């Protein structure tokens, strides 16, 4: 169902959170080789989460679940804010700008933490 497909997507989001927090530790420790690999892993995870989210939104629409569509439109928009911050973080790493990297890293943390009250709302609406 769309509800099990959303729990699958929720798990992929949790995986990115787990990898994000080991990446943050690696950045702080100056282990740049690990950061590089973790950032590639996060990209692949965020790409996947976004595809599951689009499929879920398209399905809620075909199902006429107005509330779930509203919530998923709001959630997909904020997901894109996070993705832009992520891409900027990645660019900061390539550039060697640790000041920008730290900034974007803190910003992504807060965009994702906010999005959780909506994430939890979607689960109950689908
Ligand atoms: O819960 C997932 C989530 C919520 C809010 C913002 C996000 C995000 O994941 C990718 C980056 O941006």
Tab-separated table of C-alpha atoms and ligand atoms in Angstrom:
chain	number	residue	atom	x	y	z
A	1	UNK	CA	0.000	0.000	0.000
A	2	UNK	CA	0.969	3.625	-0.065
A	3	UNK	CA	1.301	3.375	3.732
A	4	UNK	CA	3.904	0.588	3.562
A	5	UNK	CA	5.649	2.414	0.735
A	6	UNK	CA	5.902	5.452	3.050
A	7	UNK	CA	7.377	3.375	5.900
A	8	UNK	CA	9.968	2.153	3.393
A	9	UNK	CA	10.738	5.783	2.514
A	10	UNK	CA	10.816	6.734	6.204
A	11	UNK	CA	13.482	4.053	6.754
A	12	UNK	CA	15.618	5.367	3.914
A	13	UNK	CA	15.382	8.821	5.519
A	14	UNK	CA	16.581	7.314	8.819
A	15	UNK	CA	19.513	5.715	7.034
A	16	UNK	CA	20.590	9.111	5.716
A	17	UNK	CA	20.293	10.522	9.250
A	18	UNK	CA	22.543	7.750	10.554
A	19	UNK	CA	25.119	8.300	7.831
A	20	UNK	CA	24.900	12.069	8.322
A	21	UNK	CA	25.825	11.770	11.987
A	22	UNK	CA	28.874	9.562	11.317
A	23	UNK	CA	29.849	11.981	8.550
A	24	UNK	CA	29.641	14.923	10.970
A	25	UNK	CA	31.936	13.088	13.392
A	26	UNK	CA	34.364	12.362	10.548
A	27	UNK	CA	34.369	16.024	9.436
A	28	UNK	CA	35.087	17.177	12.986
A	29	UNK	CA	37.946	14.640	13.213
A	30	UNK	CA	39.416	15.841	9.918
A	31	UNK	CA	39.004	12.402	8.251
A	32	UNK	CA	38.385	13.795	4.781
A	33	UNK	CA	38.619	10.440	3.009
A	34	UNK	CA	35.708	9.179	5.088
A	35	UNK	CA	33.714	12.384	4.625
A	36	UNK	CA	34.049	12.015	0.832
A	37	UNK	CA	32.676	8.498	0.881
A	38	UNK	CA	29.872	9.401	3.322
A	39	UNK	CA	28.848	12.341	1.109
A	40	UNK	CA	28.580	10.026	-1.907
A	41	UNK	CA	26.465	7.667	0.225
A	42	UNK	CA	24.193	10.506	1.381
A	43	UNK	CA	23.688	11.660	-2.208
A	44	UNK	CA	22.551	8.185	-3.267
A	45	UNK	CA	20.266	7.914	-0.232
A	46	UNK	CA	18.700	11.360	-0.748
A	47	UNK	CA	18.124	10.573	-4.439
A	48	UNK	CA	16.317	7.360	-3.420
A	49	UNK	CA	14.216	8.962	-0.668
A	50	UNK	CA	13.100	11.655	-3.082
A	51	UNK	CA	12.007	9.077	-5.667
A	52	UNK	CA	9.951	7.134	-3.119
A	53	UNK	CA	8.419	10.457	-2.013
A	54	UNK	CA	7.452	11.433	-5.549
A	55	UNK	CA	5.868	8.026	-6.205
A	56	UNK	CA	3.935	8.332	-2.930
A	57	UNK	CA	2.743	11.855	-3.796
A	58	UNK	CA	1.663	10.799	-7.291
A	59	UNK	CA	-0.218	7.871	-5.738
A	60	UNK	CA	-2.004	9.929	-3.076
A	61	UNK	CA	-3.106	12.206	-5.951
A	62	UNK	CA	-4.444	9.323	-8.064
A	63	UNK	CA	-6.256	8.114	-4.899
A	64	UNK	CA	-7.793	11.540	-4.279
A	65	UNK	CA	-6.415	11.726	-0.731
A	66	UNK	CA	-6.578	15.512	-0.540
A	67	UNK	CA	-5.116	15.798	2.948
A	68	UNK	CA	-2.192	13.524	2.174
A	69	UNK	CA	-1.519	15.429	-1.061
A	70	UNK	CA	-1.460	18.796	0.801
A	71	UNK	CA	0.969	17.455	3.409
A	72	UNK	CA	3.151	15.741	0.809
A	73	UNK	CA	3.341	18.918	-1.319
A	74	UNK	CA	4.541	20.806	1.776
A	75	UNK	CA	6.972	18.012	2.642
A	76	UNK	CA	8.358	17.710	-0.901
A	77	UNK	CA	9.008	21.459	-1.019
A	78	UNK	CA	10.949	21.432	2.251
A	79	UNK	CA	12.825	18.304	1.114
A	80	UNK	CA	14.096	20.413	-1.789
A	81	UNK	CA	15.366	23.070	0.664
A	82	UNK	CA	17.393	20.383	2.392
A	83	UNK	CA	18.656	19.027	-0.931
A	84	UNK	CA	19.883	22.481	-2.011
A	85	UNK	CA	21.696	22.919	1.303
A	86	UNK	CA	23.203	19.438	0.887
A	87	UNK	CA	24.453	20.239	-2.599
A	88	UNK	CA	26.016	23.450	-1.277
A	89	UNK	CA	27.678	21.467	1.510
A	90	UNK	CA	29.103	19.087	-1.085
A	91	UNK	CA	30.459	22.061	-3.045
A	92	UNK	CA	32.031	23.476	0.118
A	93	UNK	CA	33.829	20.169	0.642
A	94	UNK	CA	35.148	20.121	-2.930
A	95	UNK	CA	36.282	23.730	-2.453
A	96	UNK	CA	38.007	23.140	0.902
A	97	UNK	CA	35.773	25.712	2.614
A	98	UNK	CA	35.286	24.274	6.070
A	99	UNK	CA	33.586	27.451	7.285
A	100	UNK	CA	30.820	27.077	4.702
A	101	UNK	CA	30.730	23.313	5.258
A	102	UNK	CA	30.028	23.794	8.990
A	103	UNK	CA	27.326	26.388	8.210
A	104	UNK	CA	25.482	24.228	5.685
A	105	UNK	CA	25.857	21.186	7.945
A	106	UNK	CA	24.128	23.008	10.833
A	107	UNK	CA	21.468	24.332	8.454
A	108	UNK	CA	20.669	20.891	7.034
A	109	UNK	CA	20.379	19.491	10.582
A	110	UNK	CA	17.716	22.081	11.387
A	111	UNK	CA	15.783	21.759	8.101
A	112	UNK	CA	15.550	17.993	8.646
A	113	UNK	CA	14.663	18.254	12.331
A	114	UNK	CA	11.831	20.670	11.566
A	115	UNK	CA	10.492	18.426	8.785
A	116	UNK	CA	9.849	15.637	11.258
A	117	UNK	CA	6.540	16.924	12.601
A	118	UNK	CA	5.260	16.928	9.008
A	119	UNK	CA	6.911	13.588	8.205
A	120	UNK	CA	5.035	12.063	11.148
A	121	UNK	CA	1.787	13.716	9.971
A	122	UNK	CA	2.023	12.146	6.510
A	123	UNK	CA	2.284	8.673	8.004
A	124	UNK	CA	-1.048	9.163	9.786
A	125	UNK	CA	-2.770	10.621	6.707
A	126	UNK	CA	-1.929	8.069	4.016
B	1	LIG	O1	12.738	13.741	6.626
B	1	LIG	C1	13.489	13.975	5.450
B	1	LIG	C2	13.757	15.456	5.229
B	1	LIG	C3	12.969	16.424	5.885
B	1	LIG	C4	13.220	17.792	5.676
B	1	LIG	C5	14.238	18.199	4.805
B	1	LIG	C6	15.025	17.243	4.139
B	1	LIG	C7	14.775	15.860	4.348
B	1	LIG	O2	15.542	14.902	3.729
B	1	LIG	C8	16.437	15.331	2.704
B	1	LIG	C9	17.036	16.705	3.004
B	1	LIG	O3	16.023	17.666	3.288
